[PDB]
Chain A
Amino acid sequence: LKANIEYTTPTGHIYRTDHKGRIKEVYVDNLSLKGHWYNLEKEWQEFLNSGKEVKNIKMEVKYSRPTIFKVEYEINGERNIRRILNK
């Protein structure tokens, strides 16, 4: 939480902050192995207007705490997933 600082933890973990003191980078060699709806409709319509199909639109709903939407769709033969909250 210091500005433009790099710091290394006891465990070897390296952290880098920006001018506002926000963490921007982390290094670890140690791993143990209107809004959203509008944002979504806007890009859909732009794809359609460019002559691209938006296929297989489905939603899963955890209902009524916010209602949770898991939205899915395919555009270039590629399925994308998105999460939207309603509260």
Chain B
Amino acid sequence: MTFEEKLSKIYNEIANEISSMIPVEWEKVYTMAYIDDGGGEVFFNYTKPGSDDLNYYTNIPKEYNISVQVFDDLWMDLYDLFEELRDLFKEEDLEPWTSCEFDFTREGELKVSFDYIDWINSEFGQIGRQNYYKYRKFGILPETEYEINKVKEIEQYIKEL
């Protein structure tokens, strides 16, 4: 297999894992992953057909008949897939990514965005990252001043990299 054939195999595996974590029909899924050697985070938002509303992933057990344990154990497998995606870069002697945007539609479109920002040494937290992500991806502002100011600190930080 070529490098891009290995990447395609794991794209498909990541997409189908996310899809099986969603207990209703979805139209689009926006996934963000921050991963390095010491750990990381993976969240996603999905939409349903007929609406543009974003549905956060951990709200799935709170809204539907799926146990938190089953959901989290699936999340664990999903993380492993992204770590696999990351190890593929290591094996190609490529600098491994520290963030991966993973957006796909039910029709089969997939757009991926990798970045290499040293997030852990930036000392910005998980929610700060997520709020910055959400402001750039969608148009969403945080609503508290501490949160809003943290996004501004991350913006200035990145431009000056």
* Interfacial residues, chain A to chain B (CB-CB below 8 A): 1, 9, 11, 13, 15, 20, 22-33, 35-36, 38-40, 42-44, 46-47, 50, 52, 60, 69-70, 72, 75, 78-85
A83 touches B104 (CB 8 A): no
The A interface is mostly helix, strand or loop, or mixed, namely mixed
Q: For the A-B complex with A13-B4, A29-B110, A79-B58 known, give 19 more contacts whose Cβ atoms are closer than 8 Å.
A: A22-B94, A22-B95, A22-B116, A24-B113, A25-B111, A28-B109, A29-B108, A30-B110, A31-B11, A31-B104, A32-B12, A39-B123, A39-B124, A39-B125, A40-B125, A46-B125, A47-B127, A78-B56, A85-B39
Known: A15-B4, A33-B106, A81-B58. A22 touches B114 (CB 8 A): yes
Closest B residue to A83 by beta carbon equals B39
Interface size on B, residues (CB 8 A): 54
Which of B121-143 touch A at CB < 8 Å?
123-128, 130
Closest B residue to A69 by beta carbon equals B39
A26 touches B144 (CB 8 A): no
Known: A22-B116, A26-B112, A29-B109. A83 touches B40 (CB 8 A): yes
Is B46 engaged at the interface, CB distance under 8 Å to the other chain? no
B-side contacts of A30, CB under 8 Å: 8, 108, 110
A-side contacts of B39, CB under 8 Å: 36, 69, 82-85
Query: What is the bound-complex CA distance between A83 and B11, given in angstroms?
Result: 21
Which of B71-115 touch A at CB < 8 Å?
72, 75-76, 79, 89, 92, 94-95, 97, 104, 106, 108-115
Is B32 engaged at the interface, CB distance under 8 Å to the other chain? no
A-side contacts of B89, CB under 8 Å: 23
Smallest beta-carbon distance B50→chain A, Å: 19
Partner of A32, one of B58, B108, B111: B108
Query: What is the bound-complex CA distance between A67 and B127, given in angstroms?
Result: 24
B-side contacts of A35, CB under 8 Å: 38, 120
B-side contacts of A82, CB under 8 Å: 39-41, 126
Is B146 engaged at the interface, CB distance under 8 Å to the other chain? yes
A-side contacts of B2, CB under 8 Å: 9
A-B contact pairs, 29 of them (CB 8 A): A22-B114, A23-B114, A24-B115, A25-B113, A26-B113, A28-B8, A28-B109, A30-B110, A31-B11, A31-B109, A31-B110, A33-B19, A33-B108, A35-B120, A36-B120, A39-B120, A46-B146, A46-B150, A50-B145, A70-B76, A78-B58, A78-B59, A80-B41, A81-B41, A81-B58, A81-B72, A82-B39, A82-B41, A82-B126
